[PDB]
Structure 1
Amino acid sequence: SGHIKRPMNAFMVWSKIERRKIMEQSPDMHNAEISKRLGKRWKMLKDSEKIPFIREAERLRLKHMADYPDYKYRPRK
């Protein structure tokens, strides 16, 4: 539709792969409770376990700035 999506951060791709993991190991679970548990586990992770995700998010940010260098956010009504 022409809409540029926001690039994924560390927690979104982490919760994406881990929610796909939980949905392939657990049936009959509501997704709000899944995301509550995923936020809980992400806040009990140490920072030593998160550098690949934040680095990958930084790669998406440099890909985004190299893909659109004259980009500026414009909120509309």
Structure 2
Amino acid sequence: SGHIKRPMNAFMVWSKIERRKIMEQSPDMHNAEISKRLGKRWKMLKDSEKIPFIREAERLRLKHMADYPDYKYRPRK
């Protein structure tokens, strides 16, 4: 459609993988509960444990700049 999406931050990068894991082990589980539990877990994670994901987001961000150099975030009502 032409709309350029926001880069995934570290929490989104981690959430994708962990949501997939919870889905594989515990299917038939509602997405709101999964988000609540993922938020709690992420808040418990040590900063160092978060390093791979943070950097990964940054990597994606760099790619975003290369793919859409004229891009700026524009939230609209």
Which TM-score band (shorter chain)?
0.7 to 0.9
Instruction: Report Cα offsets for 1:7-55 as digits up to 9, x if no partner.
Output: 1111112111111110110122111011000000000000010111111
Paired positions, count: 77
Shift in Å at residue 73 of structure 1?
A: 3.4
TM-score (norm 1): 0.85
TM-score (norm 2): 0.85
Which ranges in structure 1 are unaligned for 5 or more consecutive residues?
none
Which ranges in structure 2 are unaligned for 5 or more consecutive residues?
none
* 2:49 is equivalent to residue 49 of structure 1: yes
Greater RCO (CA < 8 Å, at least 6 residues apart): 2
Question: Which structure would you say has the larger Rg?
Answer: 1
Partner secondary structure for residue 5 of structure 2: coil
Partner secondary structure for residue 29 of structure 2: coil
Q: Over the residues paired in the alignment, what is the CA RMSD in angstroms?
A: 1.6
Deviates more, 1:6-15 or 1:62-71: 62-71
Distance 1:37 1:22 in 2: 10
Once superposed, which parts of structure 1, at least 4 consecutive aligned residues long, lie more than 6 Å away? none
